[PDB]
Structure formats: structure tokens, C-alpha cells
């Protein structure tokens, strides 16, 4: 079976370079084309170029000519995409795809590239209390890297919960989570947001109390 195994997520310092890999199996390595595709968060797909490791032939999208470099290690059935001098615009998922001439392509699962100078940082968690239903929340601010896991009441409160995708600002992530409960249950009963951050091995609670 044709399979492409891409390297793990990368955290890259601004200005630095990074080399992603794509290891192929299930076919004669030197006889398929490899393409690379970029996708920024919430945006579409963009073709970077093609590479034929069996001859070293290649072609770049002009948009990437000064940014991308394709190479291969035939001895390990691996192709590489090196990205130079990273900026925020280079933060994206990068996919590799392989195909024989005139045949259907097979896609890898993608490698996430995140550009930031931050070190591992646990989130600060702040309560969002209002000044028949009531909406509460918590603000999860200044953490790195992704992901965090947000729950409410240790997971027992799962209906009416919206946890929003994080946004990177000043090299750190911020997200919010809202929960909606009957007014008859808060503040008369306890509502607590729990935030786990695997990278820092932390988990903190924040009880929502009326101001």
C-alpha cells in the first residue's frame, strides 16, 4: 500500500530555517513525483512545487522560489522540504503528495509549522463573569505551545459549551471558552473551568464567581 509518513510538528524560531521530511513506502521510490502543498490556518491550499527524486528534476511555484528547497535521500526513500528564514506567513500545515506519472496521488497527513520565539509557557486563566439562561466563560491567555484542553466542572458540564480556536498574539496563544447554563443553577451552584496544558504539565481550575 502506498504510504507517506511526514515528520512531526515543528516549533520554529523567527528567522530560522526548518527542514520537513516525507518518507515513502509501498512503491518504487525513484519512480514517483513528490509535490508539496501549503495550507495556512482557515485558508485554502497552495501548491509549492514538484520534485522527482529519481532524476532530481524539480519545479517551484514562483511564489515560493526564494523560500522552498526540495532535496532527497534515495537511500531512505525520504524527500525534504526546507523552508528558509521563516516569518508568520510561513506558519501553516505542509502536505506532501506522491504519484506515478498519469496516476492518482497519495497524500501525507501533513506537518504543522508554527513560528514563535516563545519558550514553553503555561496559560493564565481568568474568569468571565457577567457584570432564563446565563452565559459564563474563561479566558485562557499567554500560553505556548498548542494545545490546551478546556473542560467545565471536570467534564460533567459539556452541553452549551463553546471553546474557540486559539489565536497567536505576540508569540503566545490566547483562547476563550463559553458555557451557558440555566440561571437557576448559577451562581447558586458551582461552575468551574479546568484548563490542562500538556507541554507545561499543568492543570488549573478557575471558579466563576459573580462580581
Amino acid at each position: 500500500k502506498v504510504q507517506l509518513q511526514q515528520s512531526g510538528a515543528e516549533l520554529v524560531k523567527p528567522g530560522a530555517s526548518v527542514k520537513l521530511s516525507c518518507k515513502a513506502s509501498g512503491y518504487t521510490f525513484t519512480e514517483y513525483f513528490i509535490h508539496w502543498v501549503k495550507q495556512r490556518s482557515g485558508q485554502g491550499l497552495e501548491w509549492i512545487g514538484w520534485f522527482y527524486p529519481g532524476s532530481g528534476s524539480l519545479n517551484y511555484n514562483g511564489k515560493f522560489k526564494d523560500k522552498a528547497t526540495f532535496t532527497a535521500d534515495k537511500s531512505s526513500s525520504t524527500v525534504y522540504l526546507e523552508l528558509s528564514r521563516l516569518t508568520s506567513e510561513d506558519s501553516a500545515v505542509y502536505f506532501c503528495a506522491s504519484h506515478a506519472y498519469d496516476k492518482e496521488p497519495y497524500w501525507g497527513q501533513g506537518t504543522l509549522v508554527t513560528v514563535s520565539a516563545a519558550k514553553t509557557t503555561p496559560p493564565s486563566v481568568y474568569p468571565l463573569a457577567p457584570g432564563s439562561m446565563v452565559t459564563l466563560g474563561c479566558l485562557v491567555k499567554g500560553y505556548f505551545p498548542e494545545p490546551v484542553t478546556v473542560t467545565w466542572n471536570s467534564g460533567s458540564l459539556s452541553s452549551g459549551v463553546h471553546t474557540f480556536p486559539a489565536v497567536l498574539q505576540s508569540d503566545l496563544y490566547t483562547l476563550s471558552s463559553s458555557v451557558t447554563v440555566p440561571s437557576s443553577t448559577w451562581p447558586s451552584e458551582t461552575v468551574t473551568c479546568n484548563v490542562a496544558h500538556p507541554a507545561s504539565s499543568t492543570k488549573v481550575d478557575k471558579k466563576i464567581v459573580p462580581r
Binding site: 509535490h35 482557515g42 485554502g44 491550499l45 497552495e46 501548491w47 512545487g49 514538484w50 519545479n59 511555484n61 514562483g62 511564489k63 502536505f95 498519469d102 492518482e104 496521488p105 497519495y106 497524500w107 501525507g108 497527513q109 501533513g110 493564565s124 481568568y126 474568569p127 468571565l128 463573569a129 457577567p130 457584570g131 452565559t135 466563560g137 479566558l139 491567555k141 452541553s159 463553546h162 474557540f164 480556536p165 486559539a166 489565536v167 498574539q169 490566547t174 483562547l175 476563550s176 463559553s178 451557558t180 462580581r211
Partner: protein, 216 residues
């Protein structure tokens, strides 16, 4: 470069519906070898794109027969015969005949439901955050439909644009609505020199914005 124009941008459907998506190229995408390299992909959030159709009309192995592709020259169509839940996501066409290879901008297949106005809630900075010398004001615009929405911030009746960050959820698995968060972040110093904070939600359900405010 060859421009791939996908229509519609968004297609609301009910499960069981017929669906049809169009992809037009700016020039012929018949390759010099005689073949036409036109592919269709479906992508879900957090996943790689999955091949549905290649060379215009050929189904990739394992793809349900409810998917079919057709077309010639510059004019291509993907059809779904009775939409299932797992078909919801973003569809892309790709031409592979002329370098640089190019994708369409995508067509989102989403579940149709009744139009719904957002539930809007505003929150002042926590005392905890202020102690740290920061001040974020948060607005939740929850459970609305359709997904298009605009938010505007006002400080003391004046429009504020800098320091605003927004985030959007995917379509809800339970009620098929969308939600949005908007956060205005100031320094504590600047926050305490103003009094009134306002977020205004404009959605197709009404020509008048939904206005939530608080006063320090």
C-alpha cells in the same frame, strides 16, 4: 497561472439532498499528453485533504459511489447523490495540467438550518487580569446562523479597531449553528481612562446590530 473558479462558495444542504459543485478554469486544462488532470478533494477540519475524483471522472479507491465527477475543457462538476453527514466539509478542485498547479478557493458544504440571531454577551476584565496590569474585554456571539457575521467595538461611543482578535467555531454538531469570540485587549492603564465598552453584532437576521455594553 491558471485560475480555478469554484461556485458556489458555500452550499447549505439537508442530509439526503442532491448537491452540485462547479469548477471553471481560466483556460483549457487538457494536458499536452491528451489527458485532463482535474481532481476533487474533500477536507474536514484538522485533517488532510482526501481525494475523491481524479482525471475528471474517476473515483479514487474507497470513495462512495454517491460521488461523481464530470466535465470537459474548462467546465467541471462534482455531484453528490444524497448527501451524508460525513460529506460536510470543504471541497477543492485542483488542475494538474499546467504548472504552477492551482486549486480552487473551495466550496463549503454545510448543514442547512433555520436562521438564528446571535446571543451576545459582554465581559469586563477580571480583577485577576487587572492585578497583572492587563485588560481584556470579551464578547461572545453565540449560536447564530448563517455563519457570516460582523463585530464592532466601541469605547466611549468611539469605534476601536486595534487590539481586537476574533475566533470562530466550526458548525455545531448538535444544533448546526456557528459561534464567534471577539476579544479587545488594552493595557490596564488605558482601560481605566475610559468608562463605557460596547460590542455590536451585525448579522443578516436584522438591520439593527445587537448591542451589549457595560460601564466601569
Amino acid at each position: 497561472d491558471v485560475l480555478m473558479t469554484q461556485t458556489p462558495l458555500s452550499l447549505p444542504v439537508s442530509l439526503g439532498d442532491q448537491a452540485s459543485i462547479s469548477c471553471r478554469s481560466s483556460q483549457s486544462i487538457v494536458h499536452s499528453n491528451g489527458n485532463t488532470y482535474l481532481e476533487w478533494y474533500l477536507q474536514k477540519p484538522g485533517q488532510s485533504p482526501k481525494l475523491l475524483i481524479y482525471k475528471v471522472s474517476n473515483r479514487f479507491s474507497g470513495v462512495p459511489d454517491r460521488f461523481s465527477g464530470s466535465g470537459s475543457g474548462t467546465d467541471f462538476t462534482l455531484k453528490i447523490n444524497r448527501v451524508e453527514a460525513e460529506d460536510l466539509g470543504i471541497y477543492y478542485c485542483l488542475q494538474g495540467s499546467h504548472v504552477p498547479l492551482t486549486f480552487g478557493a473551495g466550496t463549503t458544504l454545510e448543514l442547512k438550518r433555520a436562521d438564528a440571531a446571535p446571543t451576545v454577551s459582554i465581559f469586563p476584565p477580571s480583577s485577576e487580569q487587572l492585578t497583572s496590569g492587563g485588560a481584556s474585554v470579551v464578547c461572545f456571539l453565540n449560536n447564530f446562523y448563517p455563519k457570516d457575521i460582523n463585530v464592532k467595538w466601541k469605547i466611549d461611543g468611539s469605534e476601536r479597531q486595534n487590539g481586537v482578535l476574533n475566533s470562530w467555531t466550526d458548525q455545531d454538531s448538535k444544533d448546526s449553528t456557528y459561534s464567534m469570540s471577539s476579544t479587545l485587549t488594552l493595557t490596564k492603564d488605558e482601560y481605566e481612562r475610559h468608562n463605557s465598552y460596547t460590542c455590536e453584532a451585525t448579522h443578516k437576521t436584522s438591520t439593527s446590530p445587537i448591542v451589549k455594553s457595560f460601564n466601569r
